Amino acid sequence: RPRFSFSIAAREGKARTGTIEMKRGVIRTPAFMPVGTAATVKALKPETVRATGADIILGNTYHLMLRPGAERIAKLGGLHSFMGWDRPILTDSGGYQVMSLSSLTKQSEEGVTFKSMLSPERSIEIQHLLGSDIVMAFDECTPYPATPSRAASSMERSMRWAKRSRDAFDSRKEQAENAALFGIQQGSVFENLRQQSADALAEIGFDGYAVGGLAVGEGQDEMFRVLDFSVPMLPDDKPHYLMGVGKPDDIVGAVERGIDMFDCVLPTRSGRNGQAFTWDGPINIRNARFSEDLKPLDSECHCAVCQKWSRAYIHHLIRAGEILGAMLMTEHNIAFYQQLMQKIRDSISEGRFSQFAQDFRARYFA
Amino acid sequence: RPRFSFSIAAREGKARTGTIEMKRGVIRTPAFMPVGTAATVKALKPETVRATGADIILGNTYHLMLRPGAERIAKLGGLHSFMGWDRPILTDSGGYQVMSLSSLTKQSEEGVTFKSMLSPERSIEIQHLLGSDIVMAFDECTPYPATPSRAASSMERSMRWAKRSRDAFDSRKEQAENAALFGIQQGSVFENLRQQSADALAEIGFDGYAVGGLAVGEGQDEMFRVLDFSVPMLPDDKPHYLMGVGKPDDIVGAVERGIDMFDCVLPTRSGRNGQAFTWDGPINIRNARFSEDLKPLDSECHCAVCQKWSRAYIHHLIRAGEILGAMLMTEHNIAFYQQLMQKIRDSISEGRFSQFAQDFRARYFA
Ligand SMILES: [Cl-]
Ligand SMILES: [Cl-]
Numbered sequence: 176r177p178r179f180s181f182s183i184a185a186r187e188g189k190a191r192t193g194t195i196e197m198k199r200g201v202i203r204t205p206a207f208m209p210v211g212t213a214a215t216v217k218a219l220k221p222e223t224v225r226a227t228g229a230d231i232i233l234g235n236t237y238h239l240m241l242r243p244g245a246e247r248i249a250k251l252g253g254l255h256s257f258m259g260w261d262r263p264i265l266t267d268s269g270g271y272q273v274m275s276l277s278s279l280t281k282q283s284e285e286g287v288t289f290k291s292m293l294s295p296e297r298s299i300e301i302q303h304l305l306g307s308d309i310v311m312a313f314d315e316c317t318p319y320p321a322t323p324s325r326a327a328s329s330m331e332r333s334m335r336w337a338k339r340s341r342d343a344f345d346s347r348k349e350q351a352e353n354a355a356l357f358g359i360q361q362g363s364v365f366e367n368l369r370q371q372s373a374d375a376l377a378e379i380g381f382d383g384y385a386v387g388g389l390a391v392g393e394g395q396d397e398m399f400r401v402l403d404f405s406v407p408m409l410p411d412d413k414p415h416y417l418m419g420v421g422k423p424d425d426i427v428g429a430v431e432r433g434i435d436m437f438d439c440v441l442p443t444r445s446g447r448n449g450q451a452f453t454w455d456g457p458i459n460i461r462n463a464r465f466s467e468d469l470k471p472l473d474s475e476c477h478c479a480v481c482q483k484w485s486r487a488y489i490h491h492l493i494r495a496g497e498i499l500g501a502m503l504m505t506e507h508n509i510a511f512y513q514q515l516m517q518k519i520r521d522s523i524s525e526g527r528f529s530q531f532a533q534d535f536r537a538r539y540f541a
Numbered sequence: 542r543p544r545f546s547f548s549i550a551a552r553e554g555k556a557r558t559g560t561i562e563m564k565r566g567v568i569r570t571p572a573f574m575p576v577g578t579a580a581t582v583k584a585l586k587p588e589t590v591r592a593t594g595a596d597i598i599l600g601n602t603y604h605l606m607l608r609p610g611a612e613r614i615a616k617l618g619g620l621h622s623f624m625g626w627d628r629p630i631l632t633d634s635g636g637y638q639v640m641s642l643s644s645l646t647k648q649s650e651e652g653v654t655f656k657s658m659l660s661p662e663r664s665i666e667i668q669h670l671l672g673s674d675i676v677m678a679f680d681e682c683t684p685y686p687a688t689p690s691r692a693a694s695s696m697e698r699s700m701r702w703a704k705r706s707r708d709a710f711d712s713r714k715e716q717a718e719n720a721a722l723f724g725i726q727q728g729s730v731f732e733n734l735r736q737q738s739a740d741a742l743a744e745i746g747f748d749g750y751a752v753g754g755l756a757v758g759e760g761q762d763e764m765f766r767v768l769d770f771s772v773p774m775l776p777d778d779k780p781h782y783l784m785g786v787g788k789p790d791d792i793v794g795a796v797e798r799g800i801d802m803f804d805c806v807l808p809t810r811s812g813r814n815g816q817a818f819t820w821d822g823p824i825n826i827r828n829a830r831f832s833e834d835l836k837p838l839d840s841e842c843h844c845a846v847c848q849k850w851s852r853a854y855i856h857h858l859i860r861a862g863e864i865l866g867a868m869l870m871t872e873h874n875i876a877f878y879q880q881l882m883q884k885i886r887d888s889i890s891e892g893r894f895s896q897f898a899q900d901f902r903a904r905y906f907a
């Protein structure tokens with residue numbers, strides 16, 4: 176396999192389906208990436224992640240650079256070996272969580288200093304030490320809402336940081352030859368800033384383009400409005416990655432607007448909290464109505480959990496605080512997300528994605 | 542298969558190896574039973590429990606009679622169906638944990654009343670509703686130390702309760718025809734009381750005989766001293782079950798004294814707390830010395846954890862509080878216990894158990 180090759184096999188409107196080929200494996204798109212915080216997809220062995228259909232996982236950098244440390248992971252053979260996942264890993268830059276999770280942060284043009292310095296150069300180096308396959312440029316995730324002036328200042332700094340990220344990645348031969356680098360479009364909800372950001376990123380040149388700054392509480396209508404004008408600004412022939420999204424209906428609508436890749440903690444985190452996704456909408460398995468329900472979490476789901484255990488049993492486990500409850504809910508939810516992506520890919524390939532989206536919504540929101 | 546058949550295939554001194562055949566499966570003896578609290582072996586799917594080599598698990602009754610409730614489990618199809626374990630389950634009577642975990646307990650000849658009535662009859666009924674394969678008679682676990690008078694009074698009540706348990710079990714045709722009933726020897730550390738208890742139990746007649754009251758903080762020397770005279774008092778041709786034991790060296794010495802069955806929470810509970818069993822003794826994986834150790838938990842262990850992950854990774858997971866850490870430590874520890882039992886069975890079958898016990902101790906305590 177090549178370092179990186181994205182091929183589009185079929186299209187319907189703005190939606191696309193295809194593959195990314197990388198040295199460590201093929202990624203089917205549109206793709207959902209389960210999130211690995213701290214070198215684990217919470218409550219799942221990697222073989223179980225793979226059994227759900229995942230082709231790639233996201234590794235959070237912020238936690239790993241603190242514990243166990245990036246240099247330590249490199250000394251131990253890299254993240255893939257360490258956690259036992261041998262397929263592609265996309266790593267975030269660490270910049271978003273440094274702001275969310277640190278104390279006493281101090282921002283400058285050089286980077287961010289924080290207490291538990293992270294610059295573009297150090298972020299790219301950390302991602303190299305982890306052995307990331309898809310490296311994210313280091314940027315500033317603009318708060319929402321943002322004034323036009325502040326959104327512009329933040330986007331402009333992020334574009335300067337994108338060039339620094341590109342140059343740091345290219346100056347490390349092993350990384351440049353074996354990994355890919357994605358740039359991140361910013362600009363808040365403002366069309367002119369989104370266009371300037373797209374133009375700057377395309378001039379630098381990246382292997383893929385993320386739409387940043389949209390998992391920030393703005394609501395689906397506004398997110399879709401921004402995607403409507405933002406995704407067409409990005410190069411058509413490269414993957415489009417919507418960071419931090421999202422709920423099933425967010426994914427469907429984002430694919431309808433040209434997005435190829437997704438990640439979010441919802442299936443894992445909300446699974447451990449008792450929320451199970453089904454084709455008829457989410458359910459909270461802790462509800463007393465499930466205490467004697469012998470049906471599986473979802474009546475059509477093909478996952479191992481739905482083949483073997485009832486709602487009543489999982490209700491009991493989650494109410495009791497049992498680890499197996501978290502394991503089963505997470506496996507089912509990640510499997511549900513992968514089945515959603517498979518239905519999306521198949522429907523685009525067959526020219527019936529518009530109908531699929533309509534049928535999906537009618538049933539999910541009934 | 543029959544309802545119950547215990548066959549001894551080989552013997553060395555007081556040690557025995559053989560099989561218990563029951564409707565739901567064969568149990569190889571000496572046997573270690575992983576403990577299922579609240580209808581789950583904590584942090585493991587049943588298929589993983591089986592992959593470690595377990596033939597039978599122990600279900601705690603006290604928790605289940607409270608949550609989800611025995612009648613509810615019966616309505617849902619029984620414990621086996623509920624949790625997805627189709628092999629034999631031994632259930633405790635609930636009497637020990639009612640004393641440990643309840644408030645405002647009130648004891649009488651009829652049974653025990655408590656706040657979150659449990660009589661011999663109700664205990665046997667609960668175990669029936671769960672669908673237990675091996676039912677334990679309801680008894681009083683005598684505190685340690687106990688005066689001779691108090692040990693005698695408690696043992697005498699337990700023998701009256703053993704007869705009530707026998708009669709309740711026999712009066713339920715489906716239970717009598719499909720399950721087995723074990724009686725529990727009491728008498729604290731006193732040889733004369735242990736003999737009276739053995740005689741009373743043998744007169745009633747049971748499918749197997751437990752040695753009760755020895756997982757109570759008395760120390761290994763005293764436990765072994767009591768086993769030395771207590772196990773020969775029980776019928777030779779029936780299984781001997783040492784309840785609540787124990788550490789690996791406790792198991793080896795108890796087998797040398799004629800015990801066939803064991804259960805304890807040590808491998809599961811202490812696994813979640815960071816203690817891993819190895820042929821060279823236990824280690825605490827949280828210790829900083831393991832942070833860069835690429836070896837598996839144990840250098841000879843055949844378990845899936847030791848084939849795939851390093852000490853350094855599991856150290857990281859346990860320090861981070863990650864669910865996968867609990868999963869991996871528990872799988873390894875239960876696998877270690879099953880490998881110990883396999884080595885015990887093979888060495889007795891080959892007439893070299895005395896040498897095995899000596900070699901085991903020399904290395905485990907080096
Ligand atoms: Cl998560
Ligand atoms: Cl436990």
Ligand SMILES: [Zn+2]
Pocket residue numbers: 472473476477478479480481482507510511
């Ligand atoms: Zn499922």
Ligand SMILES: [Zn+2]
Pocket residue numbers: 838839842843844845846847848873876877
């Ligand atoms: Zn192992």
